[PDB]
Each structure stands twice: as C-alpha cells, then as structure tokens.
Amino acid sequence: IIIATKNGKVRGMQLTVFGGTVTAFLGIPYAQPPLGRLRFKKPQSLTKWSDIWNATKYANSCCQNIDQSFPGFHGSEMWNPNTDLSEDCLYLNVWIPAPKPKNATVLIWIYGGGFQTGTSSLHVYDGKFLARVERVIVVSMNYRVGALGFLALPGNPEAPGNMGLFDQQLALQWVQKNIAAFGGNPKSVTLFGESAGAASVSLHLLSPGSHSLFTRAILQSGSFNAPWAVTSLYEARNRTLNLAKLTGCSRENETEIIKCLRNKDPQEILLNEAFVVPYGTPLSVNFGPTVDGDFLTDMPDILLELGQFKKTQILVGVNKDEGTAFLVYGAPGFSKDNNSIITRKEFQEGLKIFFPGVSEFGKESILFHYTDWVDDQRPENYREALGDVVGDYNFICPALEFTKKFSEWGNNAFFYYFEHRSSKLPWPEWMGVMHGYEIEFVFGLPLERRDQYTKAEEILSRSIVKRWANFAKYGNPQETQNQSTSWPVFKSTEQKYLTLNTESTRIMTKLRAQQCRFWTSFFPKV
Ligand SMILES: *[C@@H]1O[C@H](CO[C@@H]2O[C@@H](C)[C@@H](O)[C@@H](O)[C@@H]2O)[C@@H](O[C@@H]2O[C@H](CO)[C@@H](O)[C@H](O)[C@H]2NC(C)=O)[C@H](O)[C@H]1NC(C)=O
Ligand SMILES: *[C@@H]1O[C@H](CO[C@@H]2O[C@@H](C)[C@@H](O)[C@@H](O)[C@@H]2O)[C@@H](O[C@@H]2O[C@H](CO)[C@@H](O)[C@H](O)[C@H]2NC(C)=O)[C@H](O)[C@H]1NC(C)=O
Ligand SMILES: *[C@@H]1O[C@H](CO[C@@H]2O[C@@H](C)[C@@H](O)[C@@H](O)[C@@H]2O)[C@@H](O)[C@H](O)[C@H]1NC(C)=O
Ligand SMILES: *[C@@H]1O[C@H](CO)[C@@H](O)[C@H](O)[C@H]1NC(C)=O
Ligand SMILES: *[C@@H]1O[C@H](CO)[C@@H](O)[C@H](O)[C@H]1NC(C)=O
Ligand SMILES: *[C@@H]1O[C@H](CO)[C@@H](O)[C@H](O)[C@H]1NC(C)=O
C-alpha cells in the first residue's frame, strides 16, 4: 500500500470493487508546478522527495472556464471540474488491481474537452472498474488546457506552444520510469482518449518524442485532422496578441509580453481567452495544438498523408449523434427542454453560427448536400440535418479519414460506431447518442448493478470493456469467449466497421460515405 517511485515513496488507498479490491493512487505529482516563471513553459522535471507522498485524494484540476449554461443540470455539470482549480495541477492517478499484478498492460487515459477544459478526476473517468474487471493498470493525468496550456509564440521557449501536450508526454514518461514498480508492463502501454483527448492521442502517434512512450492507441470521437484540433501558426499568433491587448500586456519585445502575461492572474487570463477569436462557435478551440516545430515538426496532415507516424494498431470510433450536443449552445430554435423542431431558415441561421467565416456559397453547398430529404414532410428534417452537419464535419468524417490514411501504411485498424443511448442520459431524447456518452460504457460504470443502468447496458459495457482490454493487451479487440460478432480490421477498400449497441452487433461498410465525400473532398476547397 506504499510504493517507491524514482522520486520518492507514495502512499495509496484501497478501494473495494465488486467483492474485490483495487489499489488507487490519486494525485501523484509528475512535474514541477508550472507557477511563476514556469507558466507557459514546458513542464519541468520534478525534484525528489524524502517523505511518503499521500496519494489519497484527487489533486487540483487545471485552470479553466466552466460550463455555466445549465446551472443545476447534471447533463452539463457532470463535465465541470470536481476538484479545485489551480495552476498547480500537474498530477496523475494510478489504479492497480489487487493483488498487485506482475506484468499488467497499462491503459493511459487522456481526457477531452476542446483543449480548454476537462480533468482526470471526473466520475466517468474512474479507472477502478477496468483495474478490477480486466486487471489492467489505469493511468490518467491532468494537463494544462486553454491559453495556459497552448498559448503559442512559435520558437520562443517562454511560450512555445503545445505545453499541455508536453504535460501529457511527461506523464507518459513517468509511466515508463515508474509503472513497473506498480506491477505494470511499460512495454504494454495503450493510450486512450476522447474528443480533444483522442486528438491528443493521434498527435502522440505523430510526435517522435512520444513514439517510445506507448504501444497502441484508441481514439474515441476525435483526431487531429478534425477542423477544430490544430490552430494554425497564423491564428495562434493573432490570438496571443489579442490576449495580450485584452490584458494590457502588448509589448514589442514578445518575451516582455510573456513576462507581462505571467504577472496577470489566472482568472484575468481565463476571462479574456473567450474573445481572442472575432467570431466563436460552440466548437471554438481558442488555444490548442500548433505546429511548434518541437512536439509537432510539420503540419500533421502532411505527416499523415506521407506515412510519418508510429506504426502500430489503432482503435478508432465515433457515436451516432456527435453533433447534437453543440446545437443547444447557440443554434436558434434549439433547446434541451423541447423537441427543437426548426424551420429551413432556422437551419440556415444555424449554419451561419457554426460556419461564420464560410462564404455564402459554402453555406449553400452544405444546405444543398444535407437538405435532400427522402421524406419532405418530416418536421424533424432540419433539426436532424443540423446535428448531422455538425457531427460529420467535426467528428465522424475526420475520424474516418484518419483511419483510412493510417491503415494505408499497413497497420491493423478497427473502427466502431457507437449507437446506444444511455438509459441514464439526462439530455432529451431528440439529441440521441450524444458526444461523450460512450465514455461511461468504456470505463465500465454500467457494471455496477447499483446505479440505475439496465441489464443490457451491463452486457454491452462488459463486452466493450473486454474488447478495449484485449486490444490493449493483444492488439486485437475481440471478445472471444461468448460467440460475439468478430470485429474485422478496417481496410481502405472494404472499410468494414463494427456497430456497438444492446440489440445487434453488425458488421457494416463505408460509414456515412456520401456525407464524408462532401466534407473531406469538396468542402475543403470552399
Ligand atoms: C486579428 O486581430 C484583430 C484584432 O482582434 C480584435 O481585437 C481583439 C483584442 C478581440 O477583441 C477581437 O474580438 C477583435 O476582433 C482582428 O481584427 C478585428 O476584426 C473584427 C472583425 O473581423 C473587428 O473587431 C475589427 O474590425 C478588427 N479590429 C482591429 C483592431 O483590426 C482580426 O479578426 C483577428 N483575426 C484575423 C484572422 O484577422
Ligand atoms: C424550444 O425552445 C426554444 C428555446 O427558447 C425558449 O424560451 C424560453 C422563454 C423557454 O420557453 C425555454 O423553453 C426556451 O429557452 C424556442 O426558441 C424560441 O422560440 C421563440 C418562438 O420562435 C422565440 O421567441 C425565441 O427567440 C426562441 N429562443 C431561442 C431561439 O433561443 C423554440 O421555439 C422551442 N421550440 C419548440 C418546438 O417548442
Ligand atoms: C499521510 O497520511 C498518514 C496516514 O494517513 C492514513 O490515511 C488516511 C486516509 C487516514 O485514514 C489516516 O487516518 C490514515 O492513518 C499520516 O500519518 C501522515 O501525517 C500524512 N502525511 C501528510 C504529509 O499529510
Ligand atoms: C514483461 O513483459 C515483457 C515483454 O512485454 C518482458 O520483456 C519482461 O521481462 C516482462 N517482465 C516481467 C514478467 O516482470
Ligand atoms: C528584449 O528582446 C531581446 C531580443 O529582441 C531579448 O534578447 C531580451 O532578453 C528582451 N528583454 C528582456 C528583459 O528579456
Ligand atoms: C460472457 O458470458 C458470461 C455468461 O456465460 C458472462 O457472465 C460474462 O460476463 C461474459 N463475458 C464478456 C466478456 O462479455
């Protein structure tokens, strides 16, 4: 219950899970607190300690604006930090099965949230069920989000960009140096993540500094080639300057700007992040990954296109209704509290909200491609169309394109389409299988017969958990014991994918083929 790590001993705590025991180490530091002269810098190496570090509580979450759009509503508030905000947030968590394993595969979770929010302490990222049920080790880290994590003056070590990515990288390396002491196999490390975390995972596939830090990869609802995932070096600079002016820190010595931004206080930086883009959307990523020339040596689309990435197996997937969650955060006529039937002209107005800098002709080409109703009468037609637009453009099509390009270089890839709507889903039914609501199934929360999930959800979560684990341990996401549908590899020819739900597990082909041809080939031209 005490473990010696390369920088000191840490005390853990024991959890009882399903008539058994998991050992939890919550809040292990892994970097020097990035405070004072360290803010905006790459994380620094943690200096040794002689005590027992008490790893018994989740540590501070990184500073972030929180979602206040639905005060008191669990659908939104379940994603807000459940631990004090602080700049002193570079901690990680380890769940180890009991008894202590001897060469366990390690699952490293990277949370998502548009690169501006999120924290490893969330209830639906609790790693104890995976450790209990499949006897893997689960690791998760906090990493700096927003401008504190991704503010970029490229080339300038005072604000080089991609600090949050380097936080993640530092944690991956902590797993390399220390997880063997916990009973884990550092040669069997699977990164998994969702949304911006999935996109983070995919950039770890392109980053040479990360190639030796993990074995395999799982990408849930995200990848770097998503339109939100990489800030241009153009946007990045115009955005730090806009931050600087809104903080009265505009100097000409760009390091003087950073030193000036360093003595502003977190909430003053946080309050101004929102306005560095002239027009934002519910998908805005004001401060995200950039081609820093360090973590990321070239535009990632080129590296993807030209085969420059770690060669290994990947597991990629998306949910049936990725886009709906964003509609009630700005789109006219939408509300979580009715069925949000919108008209044609509301739909068009919605496009102007989601595609502000897109020409009139671009916005018409979207309307044209999505408004060809099989049934002209359905009053939901435009409501569903807008969600499909938002989901295909932002998630499903970039994910498919990522998997095609990655598998063309010879590696086994598996693709899933999650289409089960949680029976506990607090959001209205019309929003469907929403962005982020497969995470609870992946982490095995429906395995706890106490918390209001159906039988069928237990069965499906149990199968997903087995498949994620077999992918991590063995590179192959099969459930071999219970006469399950075999999960085929995804090849750029047949493009077979696996659907996940309670009813039927079907092999299908060429997900959203007609919609993605518009987004991936035509639309980038406009
Ligand atoms: C590049 O920077 C300028 C400055 O942004 C403005 O000031 C910031 C501090 C912030 O408050 C933003 O909301 C502002 O927009 C941007 O130029 C402005 O453009 C918008 C309309 O596009 C408008 O507010 C003003 O006409 C412009 N202001 C100035 C001083 O020129 C510009 O949009 C930024 N981005 C790009 C891609 O050019
Ligand atoms: C669904 O609800 C939306 C959201 O607006 C409502 O306004 C509050 C007063 C309350 O009634 C809540 O349920 C919502 O927050 C409706 O959009 C509104 O529509 C009316 C009439 O068109 C208009 O006055 C408002 O500007 C709209 N608000 C917006 C666009 O934010 C919508 O009409 C409702 N749809 C259905 C089918 O009931
Ligand atoms: C670290 O914790 C030591 C023992 O704490 C034990 O665990 C917690 C959960 C409580 O149940 C406590 O009563 C247990 O004994 C302390 O003795 C020690 O002082 C702590 N160290 C620091 C630096 O806080
Ligand atoms: C763990 O497995 C690796 C190969 O994945 C092996 O080289 C190593 O010796 C093993 N360590 C143990 C069993 O302690
Ligand atoms: C001002 O900028 C120069 C480079 O133009 C840099 O060398 C110097 O360190 C900056 N001033 C301070 C006080 O850092
Ligand atoms: C396989 O089926 C058994 C019932 O025979 C069930 O208890 C078990 O949880 C299932 N395992 C998986 C991985 O689905």
Numbering used by the authors: 4 to 529
Lines quoted from the article behind this entry:
Brain butyrylcholinesterase (BChE) is an attractive target for drugs designed for the treatment of Alzheimer’s disease (AD) in its advanced stages. In the case of BChE, the active site is buried at the bottom of a deep aromatic gorge, at the entrance of which there is a peripheral binding site (main contributors, Asp70, Ala277). The active site features a choline-binding pocket (main contributor, Trp82) and an acyl binding pocket (main contributors, Trp231, Leu286, Phe329, Phe398), which accommodate the choline and butyrate moieties, respectively, of the substrate butyrylcholine (or its analogue, butyryl thiocholine). The catalytic activity features residues Ser198, His438, and Glu325.
For the design of probe 2C, a more conventional approach was therefore adopted, based on the crystal structure of inhibitor 2 in complex with huBChE. As the naphthalene and 2-(dimethylamino)ethyl moieties form crucial interactions with the active site, the indene group was replaced by a 7-(diethylamino)-3-(thiazol-2-yl)-coumarin moiety. Indeed, the indene only has non-specific interacts with the protein scaffold, and it is furthermore oriented out of the aromatic gorge, towards the bulk, which suggests more permissivity in terms of fluorescent group substitutions. Unsurprisingly, compound 2C showed lower huBChE potency when compared to parent inhibitor 2, which is known to be one of the best reversible inhibitors of huBChE. However, compound 2C maintained good affinity, with an IC50 of 88 nM. The piperidine moiety interacts slightly deeper in the active-site gorge, stacking between Phe329 and Tyr332, while the dimethylamine moiety engages in cation-π interactions with Trp82. While the thiazole ring is positioned close to the parental indene moiety, no clear electron density is seen for the fluorescent coumarin-derivative moiety, which indicates that it does not interact with the protein scaffold and is likely to be free to adopt a variety of conformations, all of which will be characterised by the coumarin exposed to the bulk. Probe 2C showed relatively strong emission in the buffer, and the addition of huBChE induced an approximately two-fold enhancement of its fluorescence intensity. Improvements to the ratio of the fluorescence intensities between the bound and unbound probe might be obtained by the introduction of a more environment-sensitive fluorophore that can interact with the protein scaffold, in place of the 7-(diethylamino)-3-(thiazol-2-yl)-coumarin here, which does not. Most notably, the emission of probe 2C is significantly enhanced upon binding to the active site, and thus can be used as a tool to study the activity of BChE.
